[PDB]
């Protein structure tokens, strides 16, 4: 789906498969957290469906030794003094010592600051200990989380449910057409991005020779030149787009192992899964009620959330005994305008926007040799058009797709291409559309606050700020205190402080609330990107103090108060709202549940010969299924005729469906539902087993 999804896919610890315990066989104890996973397998991250606990993810620092056990690095404290040498321990070796956590106060020598340290002893035991019994200590306060979990600012502020949906959801974000990195993020994203392999790095050090859209040419100091390609609009496995963009300017000095191109989702060599948006937290006239989301039209006009989705369809020319099929331009009984897009080859030319139902590849099977029908001999005789030895099986555009034809590709027997056994040419075609966001697409923040967009207001209706900036997204209040995850509010406050920049009062001295604040943080320039790691970020007092020093606006005024609440004007009414609303920035991502994929309707269609029910599938606009609890609903209503209609003419009886379709097109009453054709078959089968079934009328005589 993006870089983070792939990197996470490769670090996976799966419990299922060939040679392991079954899914139904694994007890409920195998599936929960165990006090020895600490620092090896992430307790937070897991799938949410029926494979919960059965797929974990390898922790950040953990690494696997030869035999096959997972080890985590510690540092060793010989006698209350912390070393710089680190030992990788397994789960059974660690059970034999006493391990203290990375928050223990340390001197500059490595001397323990207090008398008693908190430590983990044996299995699932926590206790204070005098400073002599301390053997080891953790590498980093975020040693116990995964790579996807590691990128959730203020993760120790959420609960495990919303943290889980947050980690889980980040690996389903669609890469946009533009990327920006988040104004508030973890130290994790430069590292994650460079590792997951979709940025192009520089192998040696040198000077940029020439920059293209297609390639970068580097000049080594050695004298030899290395040229890197950048694949442009590749259809990645999950239908999203992959694009590489040379990030460096021409004639520059590049270090060895430096980023040079920006893959999908990466900005400046950084894991960027969304955009920064100006959010205000309140209910707004029930358009965001029940976890939906109000979007500002500015996003759709500026292309802030546009994506590129690239499809592919494939059809081929395989031999049948009646003859060898072929892909060719002319097609019986299709006007010239419809066939204008295809060329002489039979394939659509590159860049012709295709509405559904259109032809992409024109192929004809040699029609099975039957006799030419006499009624058809007169019908075709009056005009003089022969139904040739060929029927028409041309590749067509499924409904609900559009876009351009960016590239076609063909395999032949003459080219010497490897082909499957019995097919002569295979043809694929790529169609790429550009989706703008709208109703019914899923959005999500980073703390597992999903949502569908239920409305898009026009720019001049959004509650706007005292200086006339309209907010972009309006996230309701009622889902913050119920989920029990307030990391999003802190992410918003900090985010606003990153937007405006700030300058602490350092002339009089340093105020107390910023004593432990780093020196580079005393004073930020507008739109400065901060980082707050996991389990070691901005504290409360430090945040609150940062909200008093926000730089005043280009008009002169200061827009949010000491609380983080601002005064908003109502776009429709034009009055000010009667209280201050909480505005600020947030990092929002566009998930992969789009309304164009997940919409199917079907009045009639193609059925299946044997089950005689409508043929399933989202790709053949199959009909949607009507299970058993919907029947119990029907019967609790007393709706006899609706349920008898669903169960008979809408699925099984062929006679019924033909009669109903015909009566509807003709404009007469639909026939009143009688006895299914299925009944007579039940009786023919009971009559097969030498049972004898008769039907009794009121009087008692058979029928």
């Amino acid at each position: 789906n993006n870089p983070l999804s792939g990197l996470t896919h490769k670090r996976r610890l799966s419990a299922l498969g060939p040679g392991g315990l079954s899914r139904e066989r694994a007890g409920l104890e195998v599936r929960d957290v165990h006090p020895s996973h600490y620092g090896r397998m992430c307790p937070i991250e897991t799938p949410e469906g029926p494979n919960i606990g059965l797929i974990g993810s390898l922790s950040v620092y953990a690494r696997v030794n030869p035999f096959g056990f997972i080890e985590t690095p510690y540092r060793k404290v010989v006698d209350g003094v912390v070393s710089d040498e680190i030992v990788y321990l397994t789960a059974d070796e660690e059970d034999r010592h006493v391990v203290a956590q990375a928050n223990s106060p340390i001197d500059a020598d490595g001397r323990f600051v207090e008398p008693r340290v908190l430590v983990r002893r044996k299995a699932g035991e926590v206790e204070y200990v005098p400073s002599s019994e301390v053997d080891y200590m953790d590498v980093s306060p975020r040693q116990m989380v995964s790579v996807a979990t590691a990128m959730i600012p203020f993760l120790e502020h959420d609960d495990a449910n919303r943290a889980l949906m947050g980690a889980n959801m980040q690996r389903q974000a669609v890469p946009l057409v533009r990327s920006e990195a988040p104004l508030v993020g973890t130290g994790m994203e430069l590292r994650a991005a460079i590792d997951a392999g979709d940025v192009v790095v520089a192998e040696e050090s040198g000077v940029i020779e020439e920059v293209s859209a297609d390639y970068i040419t580097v000049m080594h100091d050695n004298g030899t030149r290395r040229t890197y390609r950048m694949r442009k609009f590749a259809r990645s496995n999950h239908g999203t787009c992959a694009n590489q963009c040379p990030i460096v300017d021409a004639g520059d000095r590049v270090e060895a192992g430096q980023v040079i191109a920006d893959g999908p989702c990466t900005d400046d060599g950084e894991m960027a899964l969304g955009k920064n948006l100006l959010v205000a937290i309140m209910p707004w006239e029930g358009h965001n009620y029940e976890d939906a989301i109000i979007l500002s039209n500015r996003l759709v006009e500026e292309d802030v959330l546009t994506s590129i989705h690239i499809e592919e369809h494939e059809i081929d020319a395989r031999d049948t005994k009646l003859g060898a099929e072929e892909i060719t331009r002319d097609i019986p009984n299709i006007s010239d305008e419809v066939l204008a897009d295809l060329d002489e080859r039979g394939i659509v030319r590159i860049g012709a926007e295709v509405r559904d139902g259109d032809i992409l590849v024109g192929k004809v099977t040699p029609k099975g040799e039957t006799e030419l029908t006499p009624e058809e001999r007169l019908l075709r005789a009056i005009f003089g058009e022969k139904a040739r030895e060929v029927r028409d099986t041309s590749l067509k555009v499924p409904h609900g797709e559009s876009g351009k034809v960016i590239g076609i590709r063909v395999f032949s027997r003459e080219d010497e291409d490897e082909l499957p056994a019995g097919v002569n040419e295979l043809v694929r075609v790529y169609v790429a559309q550009k989706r703008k966001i709208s109703d019914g697409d899923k959005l999500a923040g980073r703390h597992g606050n999903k949502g569908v967009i239920g409305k898009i207001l026009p720019v001049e209706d959004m509650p706007f700020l005292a200086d006339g900036t309209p907010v972009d997204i309006i996230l309701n209040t009622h889902g913050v205190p119920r989920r029990m995850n307030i990391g999003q509010i802190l992410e918003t406050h900090l985010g606003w402080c990153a937007h405006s920049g700030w300058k602490v009062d350092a002339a009089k001295g340093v105020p107390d609330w910023a004593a432990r604040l780093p020196d580079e943080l005393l004073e930020a320039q507008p739109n400065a990107i901060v980082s707050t790691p996991v389990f070691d970020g901005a504290q409360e007092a430090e945040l609150q103090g940062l909200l008093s020093c926000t730089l005043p606006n280009r008009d002169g005024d200061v827009l949010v108060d000491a609380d983080g609440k601002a005064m908003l004007f109502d776009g429709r009414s034009g009055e000010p709202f009667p209280y201050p609303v909480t505005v600020g920035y947030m990092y929002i991502m566009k998930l992969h549940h789009l309304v164009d994929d997940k919409i199917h309707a079907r009045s009639t269609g193609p059925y299946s010969m044997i089950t005689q029910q409508p043929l399933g599938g989202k790709a053949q606009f199959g009909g949607q299924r009507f299970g058993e609890m919907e029947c119990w609903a029907m019967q609790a209503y007393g709706a006899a005729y609706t349920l008898q209609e669903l169960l008979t003419i809408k699925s099984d009886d062929t006679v019924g469906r033909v009669k109903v379709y015909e009566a509807i097109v003709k404009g007469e009453n639909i026939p009143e539902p009688g006895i299914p054709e299925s009944f007579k078959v039940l009786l023919k089968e009971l009559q097969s087993l030498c049972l004898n079934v008769e039907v009794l009328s009121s009087d008692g005589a058979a029928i």
Binding site: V60, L190, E270, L521, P533, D536, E542
Partner: peptide
């Protein structure tokens, strides 16, 4: 520059503890 990576754009950090080993 505390960051190992050659030309990485820098984020001020609310880091209270120095990390002994790099990831």
């Amino acid at each position: 520059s505390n960051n190992s990576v050659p030309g990485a754009p820098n984020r001020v950090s609310f880091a209270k503890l120095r990390e002994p080993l790099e990831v």
